[PDB]
């Protein structure tokens, strides 16, 4: 195939230059499990039990007894396939555009196929990271004009039925108020049996800069970050608490455990960008190529994620 | 059946895509193996 | 509209608590059920789930059915529906029942009666007493724990 | 109201005859299709299947969609829908189309081949001003309220 | 001043970290969504009709016909790209629908836009529908995302 098709060989020889996605830092090695599905859905079944009323006293003769009820829950995860197209210069036409230190028409913004593919793959990986973190797909910095997505497609920041805290605008710079809200969210968190697990916190750079200050008369050898780590260690059975900073978030703090039982990422085996076999060709030197990627696959138990939003005026 | 294997020779585009997927999986496995998170 | 919600849940359920986990629409049956209770099954005409049912007669070509209703036509209370067969489980008004029932859109100990749509409402001819306050499952769906024991005298 | 019937069938079909076996609501696309046709897809609001579509704009958070409509707002003709993704396939009004389209349930008996047709507010064809559409057959009734007709649309008129 | 690629060189390297709002530049040639079955024609360029509606202009007869910025009843197509070395403008005919960024007269989604005498879109014959609000790149340069669907009254 490599002899017959130049584009496949170029993709194979340049695929190693693409950096790994940053989403991998947000999940434990066991939390990610690939699935074989391009588009469609997957279903799972859970069973719950509940007590209808107070227990019945067994005294003398009695026929009416309190009952224990059961319930089924079906959880569906949806997957979506998306595609992009990019223009580039033909392989037989590269020699007429090779220059002293570059290849491609600068005046017309035309590139060799390899470089164009690498840049498009990097941009698509950035978009996938954004979708995984925030649960939305958009190209505007304001976040509007979002692509309409299928239901049962959520991210870590838009997951429903999670603990949500709001820090008031007037206390935007008050780390004591921020930590009070964080403690309230931590108290409302419900880990249950899966408590002896590492915890993960993701913060914006401004939040991290506020954190790194000493704890408050100010204390010695004790920072707000250390106090937060101790607070989370109180509830995770003194397990490792990791802290990461992401420029994608803005005035947002995300706290969640790293246990596969509570939160699991089952992405498609074709989620990362993949070249298409169809290549548009014409009499000119400009060709077109396509890249495919797959979105969806995040599953989380309810009331297991704390999302703190610091309102900015 | 991965692009990281120099001896690999894709017969067709389907095998090439499968090799790409295997290469991505091996890369993420290697990243998790090499990762060392900073405690405290 | 459906005993089991048609839309699939997006998230797993949290099952570490044990309090107030029974206020759901899929809680068929009764809170206190006796082994000596009389249970019938009828063809369903509509969605009479967790509603007072009355006998409905067609043109005689097919058998009778049960539909949501009350007043002077009440026959029993529906507590379960098999959707595949269109079967409504009915406990006759002659047999007392205690459970969660649909409430018209109330304090414990108030007297309740079934309306034209098979929904409980505050008060005449039916012995029904609410044992709790209204629980709002949806903007239009309200349930209430009530005990119905026969019919009163006018 | 769906590309494929929601209710299942109790009978096997008879694959013996070969005439008049295409007058079904599941027949997507066009009877005559060119390989050089421009095809788009859009999010679907409602069910604009086999109907003229127009652009619908929301508050701004989400992208634009396509809804059943016509008149001065006609953008194209919907020929297929993928229900799982809510995707409506659209052929622009600037591209020629020939196929089966929904007809208004009023005077459908008076529709004859060679009659001029125009889209209404609901994306349904009706006998006539601004769209060049000509019926190539008579109304075929698939349901008590569902009528289809073979028509060709070849752009706007002066 | 108005060329697709600025002649003034850049002082600093750009920061290739963000991926949002990096396409609202005047150098973005073509359309946001393009099909492989689109018809495009190169024509000699009279003036600078880049990202403007074009009309056919005839000389005395010694030289061939060319295209110049314009609209109205004389509108023939939309210029989406230009090669300055050859002076060749790529035009998509009005018979072909196009979706992309076009020059707007110095506006909300859903507005109806028609080309003026200078090949600039303006609010209302209807030729396009605005898909976004005007984006200012210069004190007199305003672009807008529009979708052209031919001519209709």
**Cβ burial, residue E86 (10 Å; 0-12/13-18/19+):** exposed
Assess A16–B contact: CB distance below 8 Å, yes or no. yes
Produce one character per residue of A32-47: b if its CB has 16 or more CB atoms within 10 Å, e if not.
bebbebebeebeeeee
The answer to whether D51 and D122 are in contact (CB under 8 A) is yes
The distance between the two most distant Cα atoms of chain E, rounded to a whole number of Å, is 54
Produce one character per residue of C112-151: b if its CB has 16 or more CB atoms within 10 Å, e if not.
bbbbeebbbbeeeebbbebbeebbeeeeeebbbbbbbeee
Closest to D42 measured CA to CA, from D23, D55, D31, D61:
D55
DSSP chain D: --SS-SS--SS-------SS---STT--S-SS--TT---EEEEBSS--TTSEEEEE--SSSB--EEEE--GGG--EEEEEEETTTTEEEEEETTS-EEEEEEB-SSSGGG--TT-EEEE-TTS-EEE---EEEEE-S--EEEETTEEEEEEEEEEE--
3-state SS, residue A149? coil
- In angstroms, this model's resolution equals 3.3
Measure CB to CB from residue B3 to each of A15, A270, A272 and give the nearest one. A15
DSSP A275-306: E-S--B--SSSEEEEEEEEEE--EEEBTT--E
Measure CB to CB from residue D156 to each of E35, E110, E152 and give the nearest one. E152
CA distance C52 to C71: 10
Question: Chain C closest CA to A137's CA: distance in Å?
Answer: 19
CA distances from E145 to D66, D72, D82, E110 (A): 18, 21, 27, 11
Tell if the CB–CB gap between C9 and A73 is shorter than 8 Å: yes
| Count of CB pairs separated by less than 8 Å, A with D | 24
**Residue A137: CB atoms within 10 Å:** 19
Closest to D117 measured CA to CA, from D94, D144, D136, D97:
D136
The answer to whether C78 and C53 are in contact (CB under 8 A) is yes
3-state SS, residue A132? helix
DSSP E8-32: SPPSS---TT--SS---STT--S-S
**Cβ burial, residue C88 (10 Å; 0-12/13-18/19+):** buried
Tokens of A28: 């434990």
CA distance D88 to D68: 11
Phi, psi of A175 (to 5 degrees): -65, -30
The answer to whether A67 and C31 are in contact (CB under 8 A) is yes
Assess A92–C contact: CB distance below 8 Å, yes or no. no
Helix axes of B13-34 and A6-14: crossing angle, nearest 10 degrees: 0
Question: Chain A closest CA to E12's CA: distance in Å?
Answer: 17
Name the CA radius of gyration of chain A, rounded.
26
3-state SS, residue A247? coil
Q: In this structure, are strands E66-69 and E41-46 parallel, antiparallel, or unpaired?
A: parallel
- Residues of chain A with Cβ-Cβ distance to C34 below 8 Å are 63-65
Residues 6+ apart with CB under 8 A from C22: A50, A51, A52, A69
The answer to whether E91 and E21 are in contact (CB under 8 A) is no
**Cβ burial, residue C57 (10 Å; 0-12/13-18/19+):** exposed
CA distances from C40 to A83, C2, C64, C75, C88 (A): 57, 21, 14, 12, 8
**Cβ burial, residue C97 (10 Å; 0-12/13-18/19+):** buried
CB-side exposure of A35: number of CA atoms within 13 Å?
Answer: 21
Torsion of Cα atoms, C130 then C131 then C137 then C140, to 10°: 10
Residue in the block written with tokens 């397990």:
A239
E-state strands within A90-204 = 163-167, 199-203
CA distances from A22 to A130, A245, A249, B32, D102 (A): 10, 11, 13, 12, 50
Residues 6+ apart with CB under 8 A from A194: A257, A259, A261, A262
DSSP C80-132: EEETTTTEEEEEETTS-EEEEEEB----TT-EEEE-TTS-EEE---EEEEE-S
Tokens of C82: 């098999």
Helices and strands (DSSP H and E) totals, chain C: 0, 12
Closest to C116 measured CA to CA, from C70, C78, C57:
C70
3-state SS, residue E33? coil
Residues 6+ apart with CB under 8 A from E10: none
Handedness of CA A54, A55, A58, A63 (dihedral sign): positive
Tell if the CB–CB gap between E35 and D39 is shorter than 8 Å: yes
Tell if the CB–CB gap between A139 and E21 is shorter than 8 Å: yes
3-state SS, residue E145? strand
Tokens of A222: 């004790």
* Paired strand residues for A287: A88
Q: In what order do the strands lie in the sheet with A286-295?
A: A40-51, A68-89, A286-295, A274-275
| Closest CA in chain D for residue A144 | D61
Assess A6–B contact: CB distance below 8 Å, yes or no. no
CA E119 to chain centre: 8
3-state helix, strand, coil in chain A (%, to 5): 25, 30, 45
Question: Chain E closest CA to A141's CA: distance in Å?
Answer: 5
CA distance A9 to A17: 14
The 8-class DSSP code of residue B18 comes to H
């Amino acid at each position: 195939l490599f002899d017959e098709n130049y584009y496949a060989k170029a993709v194979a020889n340049i695929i190693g230059e693409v950096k790994d996605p940053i989403m991998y830092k947000w999940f434990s090695p066991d939390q990610i499990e690939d699935v074989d599905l391009q588009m469609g859905y997957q279903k799972t079944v859970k069973w719950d039990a509940f007590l209808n009323a107070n227990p019945t006293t067994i005294a003398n003769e009695v026929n009416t007894i309190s009952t224990i009820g059961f319930s089924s829950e079906v959880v569906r995860l949806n997957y979506l396939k998306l595609q992009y197209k990019f223009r580039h210069l033909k392989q037989t036409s590269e020699k007429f555009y090779t220059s002293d230190s570059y290849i491609g028409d600068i005046n017309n913004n035309l590139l060799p196929f390899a470089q164009a593919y690498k840049l498009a793959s990097s941009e698509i990986i950035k978009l996938i990271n954004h979708f995984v973190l925030t649960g939305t797909v958009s190209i505007q910095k304001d976040g509007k004009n979002q692509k309409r997505l299928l239901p049962n497609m959520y991210g870590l920041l838009n997951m429903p039925e999670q603990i949500k805290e709001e820090v008031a605008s007037g206390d935007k710079d008050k780390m004591d108020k921020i930590f009070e809200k964080i403690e309230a969210g931590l108290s409302k968190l419900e880990l249950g049996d899966e408590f002896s697990t590492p915890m993960m916190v993701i913060v914006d750079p401004a939040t991290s800069l506020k954190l790194v200050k000493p704890y408050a008369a100010a204390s010695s050898c004790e920072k707000w970050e250390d106090v937060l780590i101790q607070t989370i260690k109180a509830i995770n059975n003194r397990e490792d608490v990791y802290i990461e900073t992401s420029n994608l978030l803005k005035h947002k703090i995300l706290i969640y455990p790293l246990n596969s039982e509570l939160i699991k990422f089952k992405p498609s085996k074709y989620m990362l960008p993949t070249p298409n076999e169809q290549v548009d060709k014409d009499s000119t030197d400009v060709a077109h190529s396509y890249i495919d990627f797959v979105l969806g696959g995040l599953l989380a138990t309810r009331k297991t994620i704390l999302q703190v939003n610091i309102k900015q005026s | 059946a991965s692009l990281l294997d120099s001896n690999f020779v894709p017969i067709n585009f389907t095998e090439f895509v499968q090799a790409i997927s295997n290469t991505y999986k091996q890369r993420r496995i290697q990243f998790y193996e090499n990762l060392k998170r900073h405690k405290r | 509209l459906m005993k089991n919600p048609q839309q699939d849940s997006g998230l797993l359920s949290n099952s570490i608590d044990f309090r107030d986990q029974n206020l759901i629409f899929s809680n068929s049956g009764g809170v206190c059920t006796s082994s000596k209770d009389k249970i019938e099954n009828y063809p369903a005409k509509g969605y009479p789930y967790k509603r007072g049912v009355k006998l409905s007669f067609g043109d005689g070509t097919t058998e009778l059915e049960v539909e949501a209703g009350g007043g002077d036509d009440l026959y029993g209370v529906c507590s379960d529906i098999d959707e595949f067969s269109g079967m409504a489980t009915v406990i006759p008004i002659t047999n007392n029942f205690t459970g969660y029932l649909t409430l018209k859109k109330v304090n414990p100990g108030d007297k309740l009666n079934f309306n034209q749509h098979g929904e409980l409402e505050k008060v005449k001819s039916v012995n029904a007493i609410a044992l709790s306050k209204a629980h709002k499952l949806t903007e239009d769906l309200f349930i209430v724990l009530a005990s119905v024991f026969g019919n009163r005298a006018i």
